């Protein structure tokens, strides 16, 4: 069984960490009798320098034709002062739109070995294990109309439109339901239905889908209360589904709650077609080339690729297990270094994970 | 020096806690050569039973003619099944609009005696002391157009409009700058300027007002990063100003981080005119009449009334100091009780705070 995978090294530490994840993905796959055809393509800063835009059509083609996409990082000092349309970040937005990956999955789990990195007390942080499923390509970030107008009274007025069509809510909810089935069967839908008409429609559509997934325990929660519950009792959550802006905010909160941002993977899924998998950390221009980067998030992203992309559990478990073994053996990169542990560079951490995969 | 104060006891524990704050307010003021004329008016459930609506015109009149308004709580089981316009909560929204209190001030402070109530580790929670200044009467919660429409396909579309005019942003920012001057002179403006035109205008207006408050240290922060920063290092914040929806979310998060919701006061201020002061907790229908309520939030709201409402700094300090003394003596109502303290009822806690004031 051969899969085609598009690699998007990108910028800063991206290539370093994608390279390691590639090898990890290859070994874990091999053990489960799975081989891969890898092709690297330009995106972000690297695409700008090479082609002159952040996402060349050739990259979209390769991604669309492959079975899954693994992305490193995007961004850097050099391109920060570019026109918005020519910024690296614009390439991320474009690839998401091109692949139609409307569903962003960010698992926030506190690993037994890293409990102390969280600013929450141990008994609260330990065993946190939640998944935020965030609507990724619609909502207020892309809503119309939008703009800054001057109302002929000379005064400027700024506006944006939070808007969802029923079919947009249906498809993100289904993914969430299917995702809860792959976890603990508990789904919490988060909105502002006590005030916003868009949230009322959100809640109506999710509520109606419940009968199609009767095995899943559905609940509802207001976004302001969810922001409190994440701080008070994050262990209550399994899977959460929510819109683009609430998802952006609540996922970041949950990420910081886990304590180690450099350990967190992400997956962006579409209805059919290849998904896009990347660590949530940025390109970390400062430590690029210095062998300091933490490759665990990208590795764990390769594990999400196997699981949510290719439906290859086992191969995925091998990766997750090897990450644990490495941490169990006391290995830590700078961002997760703790008193008494073994500080290591990116390369060496990669090697320790590869070593466990055998 | 004589002030007129409108008391809105409201529902559930409202009357209980306002009654105690009234007396505390009276004693603290008396010590500073300040007397008050109090007048109680109906709002919420109580107004519904008595007059038929959540906010009678007479209540609006009294509130407008007074120097400040102290509100208890709104809501109860009995009225939960009412039509929207006749829910108690409608009365809150209406009175805010009537008084034009566009600025909601919510101080989130961790009291030395109550540090362990927070789910954050001690060294992170201790000394947290921030103020969320939230735009209260505009933004997406009141934005037009809004609705759920059916498009040509028979498919429903739900929408809301996040919109601010320049003058709406100016006035909430000015209050925030003024508020930071009464604290530690640090103001962080929170928006989503990297994506939303409304936040771009927000940031432009706040940025232009900086020169008019050169003494205040202004910084800007994206709402998603703020949600992380409240978890990672909430002590970094002094004053935060932000829009209605982000302010609602970030303040609730900050409140839960403090660990003790029953201790948290609030102030809603206008350009000129009486402010509205109220505890952020609800009406707690479950414990009404049982002498269990924590009156400290309403008492501390009376302290805010004195300070932010009437500019009576000294009288306000007397209240804040007495609350501390009571807690130092080990007194705790159910919601703040811990091992080794003196569990007390609402009445008795009131009595201890009064004792300290003299």
């Amino acid at each position: 069984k051969r899969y085609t995978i598009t690699l998007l090294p990108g910028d800063g530490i991206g290539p370093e960490v994608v390279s390691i994840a590639k090898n990890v993905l290859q070994q874990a796959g091999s053990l489960e009798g799975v081989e891969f055809n890898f092709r690297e393509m330009p995106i972000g800063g690297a695409a700008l320098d090479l082609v002159g835009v952040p996402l060349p059509e050739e990259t979209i083609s390769a991604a669309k034709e492959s079975d899954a996409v693994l992305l490193g990082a995007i961004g850097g000092y050099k391109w920060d002062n570019n026109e918005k349309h020519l910024r690296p970040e614009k390439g991320l937005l474009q690839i998401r739109a091109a692949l139609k990956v409307f569903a962003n999955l960010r698992p926030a789990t506190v690993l037994p070995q890293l409990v102390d990195a969280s600013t929450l007390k141990r008994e609260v942080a330990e065993g946190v294990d939640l998944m935020v499923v965030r609507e990724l390509t619609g909502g207020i970030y892309f809503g119309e109309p939008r703009g800054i107008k001057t109302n002929e009274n000379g005064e400027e007025v700024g506006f944006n439109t939070e808007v969802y069509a029923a079919h947009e809510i249906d498809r993100i909810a289904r993914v969430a339901f299917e995702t809860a089935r792959k976890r603990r069967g508990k789904l919490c839908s988060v909105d502002k239905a006590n005030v916003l008409e868009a949230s009322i429609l959100w809640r109506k559509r999710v509520t109606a889908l419940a009968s199609e997934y009767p095995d899943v325990e559905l609940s509802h929660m207001y976004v302001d209360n969810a922001a409190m519950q994440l701080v008070r009792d994050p262990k209550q959550f399994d899977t959460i589904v929510t819109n683009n802006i609430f998802g952006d905010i609540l996922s970041d909160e949950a990420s910081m709650i886990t304590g180690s941002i450099g350990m967190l993977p992400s997956a962006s899924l579409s209805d059919s077609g290849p998904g896009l998998f990347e660590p949530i950390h940025g390109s970390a221009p400062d430590i690029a080339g210095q062998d300091k980067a933490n490759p665990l998030a990208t590795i764990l992203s390769a594990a999400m690729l196997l699981k949510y992309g290719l439906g290859e559990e086992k191969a995925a478990k091998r990766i997750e297990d090897a990450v644990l073994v490495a941490l169990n053996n006391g290995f830590r990169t700078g961002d997760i270094y703790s008193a008494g542990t073994k500080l290591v560079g990116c390369k060496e951490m990669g090697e320790e994970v590869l070593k466990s995969v055998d």
Side-chain angles (χ1 to χ4, degrees), chain A residues 242-268:
Chain A
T242 189
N243 65 13
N244 203 342
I245 193 164
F246 298 157
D248 188 16
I249 299 165
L250 293 173
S251 174
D252 276 7
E253 183 183 350
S255 298
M256 190 58 77
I257 282 172
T258 65
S260 306
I261 301 292
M263 293 287 307
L264 303 171
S266 81
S268 309

Side-chain angles (χ1 to χ4, degrees), chain A residues 17-275:
Chain A
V17 303
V18 161
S19 172
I20 296 164
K22 175 200 183 184
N23 296 321
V24 169
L25 175 59
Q26 216 159 5
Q27 295 305 305
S30 179
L31 286 165
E32 290 299 354
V34 178
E35 199 155 2
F36 304 90
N37 200 317
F38 294 100
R39 176 177 190 205
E40 298 187 14
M41 301 291 285
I43 191 161
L48 281 159
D49 290 351
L50 194 53
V51 184
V53 295
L55 185 65
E57 187 64 35
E58 63 171 4
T59 298
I60 296 170
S61 295
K64 292 179 82 187
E65 299 181 12
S66 76
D67 288 306
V69 184
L70 184 59
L71 163 69
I74 281 168
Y77 300 133
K78 189 213 264 210
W79 310 280
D80 288 341
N81 295 337
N82 286 352
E83 304 186 59
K84 202 181 183 60
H85 78 293
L86 294 184
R87 284 179 202 165
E89 313 75 30
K90 178 66 177 183
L92 183 52
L93 299 192
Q94 291 175 327
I95 196 83
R96 287 162 175 187
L99 296 173
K100 306 185 183 218
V101 282
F102 61 79
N104 190 251
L105 277 59
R106 297 189 177 200
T109 75
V110 173
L111 306 172
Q113 313 82 349
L114 307 177
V115 178
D116 289 334
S118 172
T119 52
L120 281 62
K121 293 165 180 173
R122 181 166 196 89
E123 60 270 18
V124 183
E126 194 162 350
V128 164
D129 179 6
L130 62 87
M131 173 75 83
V132 175
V133 181
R134 156 188 172 206
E135 207 288 326
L136 186 59
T137 51
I140 192 177
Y141 291 167
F142 300 97
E144 293 287 344
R146 66 193 298 165
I148 293 173
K149 73 182 186 181
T150 120
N151 62 10
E152 294 288 9
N153 303 17
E155 182 180 43
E156 284 191 328
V157 177
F159 57 100
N160 290 101
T161 300
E162 162 75 354
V163 49
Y164 279 100
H167 77 283
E168 288 181 286
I169 302 159
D170 281 354
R171 68 188 177 192
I172 187 65
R174 292 193 147 97
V175 167
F177 274 111
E178 298 165 3
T179 298
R181 290 173 158 177
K182 294 171 192 179
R183 300 173 47 84
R184 322 197 293 279
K186 297 178 174 176
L187 172 62
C188 178
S189 182
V190 172
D191 62 36
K192 236 309 186 199
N194 53 358
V195 180
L196 305 176
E197 286 84 332
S199 280
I200 293 180
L201 176 56
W202 178 281
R203 185 170 295 213
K204 188 203 297 183
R205 303 301 301 189
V206 180
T207 296
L209 283 167
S211 56
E212 301 190 29
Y213 307 89
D215 51 315
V216 177
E217 282 177 350
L218 172 69
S219 65
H220 302 270
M221 186 180 296
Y222 298 132
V223 61
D224 45 320
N225 192 39
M228 304 178 74
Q229 292 306 321
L230 284 171
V231 164
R232 186 187 74 85
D233 184 30
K235 271 145 72 181
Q236 71 187 269
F237 294 110
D238 165 3
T239 309
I240 289 161
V241 68
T242 189
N243 65 13
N244 203 342
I245 193 164
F246 298 157
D248 188 16
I249 299 165
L250 293 173
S251 174
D252 276 7
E253 183 183 350
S255 298
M256 190 58 77
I257 282 172
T258 65
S260 306
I261 301 292
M263 293 287 307
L264 303 171
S266 81
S268 309
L269 310 177
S270 53
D271 178 49
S272 41

